[PDB]
């Protein structure tokens, strides 16, 4: 019988490279941990590019007698090396992938020193390093660490295969990985109900399984396989689901039904704390892509991400594209060996996730490299023949060793350039890009991003064009039968190197800001929701007379899953439907109100007084949404909106809390350049500065819980607002 | 002998309409004073629209026996009624013109109580109120007050005329204005040196004056006429200059010489404090228009402004266009009666200023109104035959009662509107605008503004366009001989009503921010100076890789008076001349570095790293300007730049201090959203909040001197910057 327990609490952290065998002097920390907390903007991204040292005292326990004692590290950036009483026991250069330190043969009857040395240097021998990167990797032991006490003969892994999953009688085939020969018993479980069982050395089959359900994006049905070694007592469980995912030239199909893919790329970074955000924060990103942004797919730009994120995609029905750590650069032979190791470590950890339906085996936006990618493609196919292979490029006529030509197409809008005769084009035709006459599976894996940076507080007009651009691409993808779908660049604004973004160490490419608060472009994606799952209706306006050139709010884009939208202003009521002429292939084309529906004269257009407005959403002639705008917004409410009011007593939790400066009818004050002064008491600490800058009228913060019970109290203050307080009960 | 003391110290201010006879509880204030200080943005502009009360206690003095004792109010907003010991002595509704309380007959020994009641209400009977106004009027006794002790026979005004001013033997004609007939003596002075003298019962003439100099924009030579009543002892001085300013259909002639006019509109408001800013600040405004922006004309948008401002223009060679209070709205017969009185008050106050070369006698941008405008036209030409009459409109075919058709032409850029055929045009031709066959003097008095709002921190591509549009209109005005010149909307970002602006109570129309710190566009104006007056070279860029769509910084606009600019980055070195083809008519066309000079293909050599750059300005073969840009800007210097290092102990001074967030090569961090914690120590209070929010990487503040001597010590703090300290010695 094994015992696993999270061992994040009680580490000691210090700058530099300390003697592994002596007690370390430094601060007590709770993992996940980021070595150097950064400002939001305009910082020296090399500040973390240096060595750090962590240490854990682990008392010997007599209940471990004759058992293996291991530490699993779920991830650390980077160049990791681990010592146990001064003796080195593993070293693992990669920053995105797990590694195990077997302590067993080096433990002594009292306290034991486990020392971990890391370095965040951009070491050219460790992918993705070697040159430029349009993201930051930070540093720290930014993922969980687990103390595992195992019987000698124990499970290290298992693979669950679902041959012929679309059948009324299903089959589960399981291939355990064990440390020595002997029986393995399996139980198929539906939560707590035992479906079937089998015992055997070798491959274990359960067949003739009736009444089970398919995993899909709508019904995320999961089952568990419990594995037991009857001789050693060991037990492990692996969730999977039953599902099929085929990339055919006619399109992507899920469980045999066609599905047009609609996704965003998502980094694993946050402001200030880098990658060191725990289970709860990881799970929240998944939920936001899936629900708020109503995507059926996410891409792990540009590395293996957290098991918590992937588990959460399993539990809520979000398809995943996961790739090896990369950003354009291909190092030497040895570098490529490590990239090939990365492929193995990515797929062996993640092969049971029904959410994962495609592997990225090229370095993102690399040039071609025949002998390198022959290797990555071969290895992926051997380790997992059940999923398609992709690998992201931004060039035409690329050598297609993989199953899907996964392409970043940035043609929108090149026609701005000076000697470009070609008209504004949202997406290229597949034959042009691939160079292959024969139809091949094809997925656009990024678009927009750097082609159209749009900051949270940028002008209404610019944000309109940003909205339009996500809409155009999504529409061209839904309209081209040869395009399996499209994945926008990108979910949120992210910190980058001095070589990218706006000089501020930020790429303003998100449809959401860096706190994952929507900008207007977000509801382009969210508005594709079916109405049964929620009404979305967001006008693309701040409702100010002279924000825009000339004045007025026409043309007004309304992002919505309503069948028609009503406009009331200045005694004019006008009902308008979704703009199908313009976005004919969108599931939920937006409503655009303009000169065709209302004239200048009607609204006293540029006849001096600014009026309030009301915008109502209609579904089958029934009013389902209402958005008011006042002519005269004034600071009315400083809203503190934590993602939860209640939390357990758990020091892994990073609680997101948004601050929004709101007028008399609850709209944000977009151009209020201001610091919200924040204090936090209770069992949690504020991450980042004490003063929070509004951008586009909102900003956000994460509060890392300490793990004690108590009440968190959040005070936010600004001289134009009433003092605002919020509490979250913990434990 | 008169005595005149400035009486701004020791007033009592209170909210509400108190009993005038009784002693007032309230706070002690030193005028200029603003009744309700406002936040920067998003505030209730109705909050000053109510009654307030001011009280001064005045000791009777035995030295005042026989004489008149008067208070001169230079301006107060609004609906002013003054009481002495409870008896009303004067009512003056207008908020921009002086008024006199004669206290003589209602004094008593000991303390006398002078009470002023004001009301900030937009009273529809008092111009410019009645409807919408794209500016705020605030409230308070926002200009100087003067205690005057005067012989019963005393001067009240005087008109200096300079007939035949271009002659070598010049002529000064004086028309004193006195309480009763009698002798008046006149000395003409150059500073302290007497030129001539004369005496008479009527109009006084000083003729055959040789060796004197004309007032121009290049040589603002002023003279003084001292008047003495020899019987009563009264003395007054009046400052003037010799210049001719003729408005012909061929254009504007100053001193017989052509001058294309290049100007900006300028308001008298500051953030927080409204209009209540003293002499130093009024002067600083004129200085920035004339030197920093190299304008030759300023228009007083939209009301008579401070004598300190006009006086300063007389001293620095800045032409003035001044008009009566107004914004679009024309009220009823009684309202028009007041606007006629307003014409008189302005012209009889200002008729000796050589800086003022045209009067605006229409309500800014009103419809025509024959009866009203016949009256203002006639009264003005009757008070002042010497200057041309203008009257700002924004309609074509307006009834021209005035000498100059003063047009706000917002044709740029209407092609934006969906139902407009007509191609993008900078200015309309004059005959299309006047509807008059024959040629008439014509001046563009506004352009751009609300047609293209641009905030300080708006995207680089947006500031480029902002720059361009200011250039196209300047270029167009310079190029058309039927256009005497143009004045831009506007010098700085100004607070406004709910009806206007971006929702935030700001119209982002300035070529400078509300602190009069320049945006990129300011350099369109500033670069027009001859380089003998200072080198300008301002590239329109933040030099970030991914700020613009796609990336990079071409096309690069460099605003300069250099004859060549050199660009240098990563092995690309190019010297480029001014784009005379695009801007044939500008005195200093900018350099534009685009695809003609550097190619797209060439830029690929840069590779994927972002590279520092170096822009150099060249004049007759010599390097006369350098601007560097780093690739990795970092917080280096939190610069505190006061306007002056030393100052007299003068309680009227509002000192402007700028705050700039600077990188290693001294460039602003344009997208650093931060609050700068400010501490002002010593003989001066900080106006507005003590946490100053950067916008475009700069912000500003005004410090009101107490009037004690000593050292102003300014500390500016931010966690990313080293602490900064500036000192200003006050004595």
TrEMBL record, chains A, B:
Domain spans labelled Glycoside hydrolase family 2 catalytic: 251-455
Domain Glycoside hydrolase family 2 immunoglobulin-like beta-sandwich: 209-243
Residues annotated to bind beta-D-galactose 2: 134, 327, 364-365, 446, 450
Binding sites annotated in the UniProt record for beta-D-galactose 1: 134, 327, 365, 446
Domain Glycoside hydrolase family: from-to ranges: 638-724
GO biological process: carbohydrate metabolic process
GO molecular function, one term: hydrolase activity, hydrolyzing O-glycosyl compounds
Residues of the Glycosyl hydrolases family 2 sugar binding domain: 46-151
Alphabetized PROSITE patterns for the sequence: GLYCOSYL_HYDROL_F2_1, GLYCOSYL_HYDROL_F2_2
Swiss-Prot/TrEMBL keywords: Glycosidase, Hydrolase
Similarity-based family: Belongs to the glycosyl hydrolase 2 family.
Name the UniProt record assigns to this protein: Beta-D-galactosidase
Organism: Paracoccus sp. 32d
């Amino acid at each position: 019988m094994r015992v696993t327990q999270k061992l994040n609490h009680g580490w000691i952290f210090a700058e530099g490279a300390a003697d592994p065998a002596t007690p370390l002097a430094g601060e007590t920390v709770t993992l996940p941990h980021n070595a150097v907390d950064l400002p939001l903007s305009y910082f020296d991204e090399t500040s973390y590019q240096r060595a750090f040292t962590y240490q854990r005292v682990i008392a010997w326990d007599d209940a471990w007698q004759g058992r293996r004692v291991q530490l699993r590290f779920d991830g650390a950036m980077a160049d990791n090396v681990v010592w146990v009483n001064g003796v080195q026991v593993v070293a693992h250069p990669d920053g995105y992938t797990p590694f195990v330190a077997d302590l067993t043969d080096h433990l002594r009857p009292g306290d034991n020193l486990v020392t971990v040395r890391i370095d965040g240097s951009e070491n050219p021998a460790i992918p993705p390093f070697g040159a430029q990167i349009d993201y930051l990797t930070y540093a720290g032991i930014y993922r969980d660490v687990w103390l595992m006490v195992l019987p000698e003969r124990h499970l290290t892994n298992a693979r669950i295969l679902t041959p012929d999953a679309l059948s009324d009688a299903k089959t589960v085939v399981i291939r355990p990985e064990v440390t020595a020969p002997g029986p393995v018993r399996a139980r198929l479980l539906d939560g707590d109900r035992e479906i079937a069982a089998t015992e055997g050395e070798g491959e274990l089959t359960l067949a003739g399984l009736t009444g089970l359900s398919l995993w899909s994006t709508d019904n995320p049905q999961l089952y568990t396989v419990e594995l037991t070694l009857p001789d050693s007592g060991d037990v492990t469980t692996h969730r999977f689901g039953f599902r099929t995912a085929e990339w055919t030239p006619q399109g992507f199909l899920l469980n045999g039904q066609p599905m047009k893919l609609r996704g965003l790329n998502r980094h694993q970074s946050w402001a200030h704390q880098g990658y060191a955000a725990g289970r709860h924060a990881q799970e929240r990103d998944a939920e936001i892509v899936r629900h708020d942004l109503c995507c059926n797919m996410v891409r792990t730009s540009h590395y293996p991400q957290s098991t918590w994120f992937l588990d959460r995609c399993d539990e809520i029905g979000l398809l995943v594209f996961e790739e090896i750590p990369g950003w354009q650069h291909i190092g030497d032979q040895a570098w490529q060996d490590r990239s090939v190791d990365n492929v193995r470590a990515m797929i062996t950890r993640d092969w049971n996730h029904p959410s994962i339906v495609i592997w990225g085996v090229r370095i993102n936006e690399s040039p071609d490299n025949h002998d390198f990618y022959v290797r990555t493609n071969a290895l992926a196919r051997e380790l997992d023949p059940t999923r398609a292979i992709g690998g992201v490029r931004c060039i035409t006529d690329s050598e297609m060793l993989e199953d899907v030509y996964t392409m970043n197409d940035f043609i929108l809008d090149e026609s701005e350039l000076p000697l470009i005769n070609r008209p504004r084009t949202a997406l290229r035709p597949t034959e042009e890009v691939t160079g292959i006459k024969k139809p091949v599976p094809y997925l656009v894996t990024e678009y927009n991003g750097h082609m159209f940076p749009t900051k949270a507080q940028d002008p209404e007009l610019r944000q309109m064009e940003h909205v339009i651009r996500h809409l155009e691409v999504l529409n061209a993808a839904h309209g081209d039968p040869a395009i399996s779908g499209c994945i926008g660049w990108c979910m949120f604004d992210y910190n980058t190197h001095k070589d990218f973004g706006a000089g501020d160490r930020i790429c303003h490419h998100g449809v959401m800001d860096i706190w994952r608060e929507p900008k207007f472009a977000a509801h382009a994606y969210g508005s594709q929701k079916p109405p049964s799952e929620g009404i979305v209706m967001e006008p693309v306006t701040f409702w100010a007379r002279g924000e825009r050139n000339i004045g007025g709010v026409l043309p007004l884009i309304v992002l919505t899953n309503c069948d028609e939208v009503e406009f009331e202003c200045a005694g004019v009521t006008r009902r308008v439907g979704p703009d199908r002429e313009r976005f004919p292939h969108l599931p939920r084309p937006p409503v655009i109100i303009d000169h065709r529906h209302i004239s200048a004269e009607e609204l006293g257009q540029w006849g001096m007084s600014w009026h309030p407005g009301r915008i109502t959403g209609w579904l089958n002639g029934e009013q389902v949404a209402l958005r008011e705008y006042v002519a005269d917004p004034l600071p009315t409410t400083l809203q503190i909106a934590p993602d939860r009011d209640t939390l357990p007593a758990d020091g892994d939790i990073d609680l997101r809390v948004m601050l929004r400066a709101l007028d008399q009818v609850g709209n944000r004050l977009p151009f209020l350049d201001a610091g919200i002064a924040v204090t936090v008491d209770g069992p949690a600490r504020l991450i980042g500065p004490d003063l929070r800058m509004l951008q586009g009228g909102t900003t956000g913060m994460l509060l890392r819980l300490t793990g004690d019970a108590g009440t968190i109290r959040i005070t936010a203050r600004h001289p134009q607002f009433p003092e605002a307080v919020a509490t979250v009960t913990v434990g």
